[PDB]
Design a protein around this ligand. Structure first.
Ligand SMILES: *[C@](O)(C(=O)NC)[C@H](C[C@@H]1CCNC1=O)NC(=O)[C@H](CC1CC1)n1cccc(NC(=O)Cc2ccccc2)c1=O
Ligand SMILES: [Cl-]
Length: 306
């Protein structure tokens, strides 16, 4: 019992983090097999940032202009290429600590763990969600670029995020490991604004199920609703529309608790329309939307990784 925002154990990803320096700039790279992945703006001066021509800037960079350090040892860079907004530095040594891994591009609403790194060294681990507006609400300072977001599937690390930028409102933007930004963001110092930060409705419902599993039941009401009636209220509160796919995904939690998804939707509608009246749910004073239904099952069933 109890329910916490819980990250994956970071051990497997800690062994992949290195420091990448190009002229003036030091940030983090991910060393998998004989390739180091890092944000392509490692090549930019602060001047360059306003309007970079990365292809032009890259012409003036050779293998020896990329300093890659794994703890205290230099890796020899024997190749480089640009794929979208990431650099791939070929090194002459396969990372002996390369875990089983995949590159995945996650969907909005999906959660992952961030290992915040500075100078190739891990500083801390926390859980994030890809927001519907394709931002993340992270904790990133100057030096954190190239830090990665990941999920673990038993022994397989799925890398889904590389950190690139901060936006107004203190939210963050980055790419998958093929270097394609999530959302419309570009790696340039220009006026960019996120979009409406809508709530992940299916994740709020998953978290309400987690509360009932943990004996926190005060918000269950005597009402039911329809998808269409719920979505009419959802839209007003900037909630994502709930689909039958979402209902289906909550099936196991509904089964566990004996509360129909539509009954829980009616409970959520009353919390949206009436607020919490100074009460809390799993020690939160607002409706938490960074737990997926899988996240709740994992934590409430104690699924493990190795
Ligand atoms: C990254 O390059 C790094 O760590 N380098 C060593 C940083 C990480 C940033 C710094 C502070 N918090 C972070 O998460 N990324 C940047 O500095 C980017 C690089 C750009 C993408 C190529 N960056 C540079 C300049 C400007 C901005 N963004 C803003 O400042 C946007 C903004 C505008 C107005 C108000 C508030 C924010 C970058 O993100
Ligand atoms: Cl809160």
């Amino acid at each position: 019992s109890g329910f916490r925002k819980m990250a994956f154990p970071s051990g497997k990803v800690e062994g992949c983090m290195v420091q990448v320096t190009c002229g003036t700039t030091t940030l983090n790279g991910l060393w998998l097999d004989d390739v180091v992945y890092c944000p392509r703006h490692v090549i930019c001066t602060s001047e360059d940032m306003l309007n970079p021509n990365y292809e032009d800037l890259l012409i003036r960079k050779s293998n020896h202009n990329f300093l890659v350090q794994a703890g205290n040892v230099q890796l020899r860079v024997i190749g480089h290429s640009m794929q979208n907004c990431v650099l791939k530095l070929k090194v002459d040594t396969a990372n002996p600590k390369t875990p089983k891994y995949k590159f995945v591009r996650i969907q909005p609403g999906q959660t992952f763990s961030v290992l915040a790194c500075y100078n190739g060294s891990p500083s801390g681990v926390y859980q994030c969600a890809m927001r519907p507006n394709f931002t993340i609400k992270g904790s990133f300072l100057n030096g954190s670029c190239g830090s990665v977001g990941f999920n673990i599937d038993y022994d397989c690390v799925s890398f889904c995020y590389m950190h690139h930028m901060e936006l107004p409102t203190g939210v963050h933007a980055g790419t998958d490991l093929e270097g394609n930004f999530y959302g419309p963001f570009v790696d340039r110092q220009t006026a960019q604004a996120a979009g409406t930060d809508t709530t992940i409705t299916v994740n709020v419902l998953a978290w309400l199920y987690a509360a009932v599993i943990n004996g926190d039941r005060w918000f269950l009401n005597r009402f039911t609703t329809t998808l269409n009636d719920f979505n009419l209220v959802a839209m007003k509160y900037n909630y994502e529309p709930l689909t039958q796919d979402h209902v289906d995904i909550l099936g196991p939690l509904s089964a566990q608790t004996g509360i129909a998804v539509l009954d829980m939707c009616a409970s959520l509608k009353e919390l949206l329309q009436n607020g919490m009246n100074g009460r809390t749910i799993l020690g939160s004073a607002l409706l938490e939307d960074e737990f997926t239904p899988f996240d709740v099952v994992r934590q409430c069933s104690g699924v493990t990784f190795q």
